Copies of this chain bind each other. A is one copy, B any other.
Amino acid sequence: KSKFRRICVFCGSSQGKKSSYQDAAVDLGNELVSRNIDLVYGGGSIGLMGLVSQAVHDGGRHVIGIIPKGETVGEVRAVADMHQRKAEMAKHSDAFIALPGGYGTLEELLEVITWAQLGIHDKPVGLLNVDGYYNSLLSFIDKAVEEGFISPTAREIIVSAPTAKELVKKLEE
Contacts and interface: CB of A to CB of B under 8 A. Distances in A.
A144 interface: yes
A16 B148 contact: yes
A29 interface: no
Contact of A110 (B14, B103, B139, B148): B103
Interface residues of A, number: 42
A111 B107 CA distance: 5
How many copies, total? 2
Contact of A16 (B82, B135, B147): B147
A4 interface: no
Interface in A130-149: 133-137, 139-140, 143-144, 146-149
A34 interface: no
> Which of the listed residues A107, A111, A149 has the most CB atoms from chain B within 10 Å of its own CB?
A149
Contacts of A136: 136-137, 139-140, 143
7 contacts: A14-B149, A16-B147, A83-B83, A83-B87, A104-B117, A107-B114, A137-B140
Interface of A: 12-18, 21, 82-83, 86-87, 100-107, 110-111, 113-115, 117-118, 133-137, 139-140, 143-144, 146-150, 154
